[PDB]
C-alpha cells in the first residue's frame, strides 16, 4: 500500500527489527508492550561485553530459571503483536541472525509471527545467516546439536552463541528452533531478489553484498538454469529460476553443499572468488567473480545491497 520495505543489516537487533515493523505499518503493538519489549531486549543480564565477555545470565547458577522467565514473557509479547499489513513486501538485506544482537531466539519468534499472520517478507542470503542454515542442516550430523565451528571462526555471532547457551541450559529447545528454521526461515530465503518495472524495462536487483550481472550469470551456471539478459523481464525470469533451484536445496537440507569452508575463509579475507564453484561464496561475500558487470545495453538496472 506504499513502497517496498527494504531493511538494512539488522545485526540481529530484534528491537530495531520491531521498530521498523511498527514505523512501516506492518505490525501493531501497544506502547506499553513495546516498552516491555525494549526492556527485555536491554536487560543487563542479557548484554555481552557488560561485566564479562559473556552476558551475566550464562554465568549465573540459576541461568535456566532466568532464561525461562525471559522467554515466557517474550513469547507473551509476541502473542500480542498483530500484523496489520499483509500486502507490503518486506525485504531483509540480511544479518538478521548470528550477529552482534542479544539472542537469535528474539528475531526467530518475530519471523514466525510474521509468517503465521500472513506478512510478505524475504530474506537475502548472507554470511551470517548461512551459519544458522548450516547449523540447522547439519543438526543430526553433529549429534543433535546446533554448531558451526568453522563458520564461527570468520564472524562474530553473539546472538547465535547466546542461542546455543540457552539451549544448553535447557531453557530453549532444539525442536522449536529447528521447526522455525524449516517451517519459516528457509522457505523465505533468496540468494538475490528484484523489483521489476516491465513497462520501463528497468529492474532493481537486491542482494546482501555488492554483485554484478557476472555473479547472476555464475549463479545460473551453478544451478544449471538458462541465463538470459535480453531485457529486464528476462533477467527477472533468470533470477526466479536461480531462486527456484535454491529453494530445492533449502528443501533437501543441502544449502551447505553450495560452498566449502575454504571459500568462506578466503571470502572473509577479502580475496577473489573467481572459480565457478565459488559463485555462491562470491555472492554472499560480495567478492570478485571475474570482471564486475553493472550495465547492460538491453535494460536499465540498479543494484541495492548492504555494506560489510
Author numbering: 24 to 331
Copy out sentences from the published article reporting this entry, exactly as the authors wrote them:
IcmW-Interacting Protein B (WipB) is a 60 kDa Legionella effector of unknown function originally identified amongst a cohort of proteins that interact with the Dot/Icm T4S chaperone complex IcmS/IcmW10. Our data reveal that WipB is a modular effector, with an N-terminal Ser/Thr phosphatase domain related to the eukaryotic phospho-protein phosphatase (PPP) family, and a C-terminal domain sufficient to pilot WipB to the acidified LAMP1-positive lysosomal compartments in eukaryotic cells, where WipB interacts with the v-ATPase and the associated LAMTOR1 phosphoprotein, key components of the lysosomal nutrient sensing (LYNUS) apparatus. We propose that WipB is a lysosome-targeted phosphatase that modulates cellular nutrient sensing and the control of energy metabolism during Legionella infection.
The crystal structure of the N-terminal domain at 1.7 Å resolution comprising residues 25 to 344 revealed that WipB harbours a Ser/Thr phosphatase domain related to the eukaryotic phospho-protein phosphatase (PPP) family. The resulting fragment, WipB25-344, also yielded a stable protein, which in contrast to WipB1-364 crystallised readily. The structure was solved using the Molecular Replacement method, with the recently solved structure of WipA (a protein with 34% identity at amino acid sequence level) serving as a search model. WipB25-344 crystallizes as a dimer in the asymmetric unit. In chain A, density for residues 332–344 is missing while the same region is resolved in chain B, This region in chain B interacts with chain A, probably an artefact of crystal packing as WipB25-344 is monomeric in solution. The structure of WipB25-344 is very similar to that of WipA24-435 determined previously (the structures align with a root-mean-square deviation in Cα atoms of 1.9 Å over 279 WipB residues). In the PPP family, the DxH, GDxxDR, and NHE signature motifs are strictly conserved and comprise most of the residues that form the catalytic site14 WipB exhibits similar motifs, namely GDLHA, GDELVDR, and NHG, and these motifs cluster in one particular region of WipB25-244, on the loops connecting β1 and α1 (GDLHA), β2 and α4 (GDELVDR), and β3 and α5 (SNG). In WipB, Arg310 (equivalent of Arg369 in WipA), is conformationally restrained away from the active site and therefore cannot assume a role in substrate recognition.
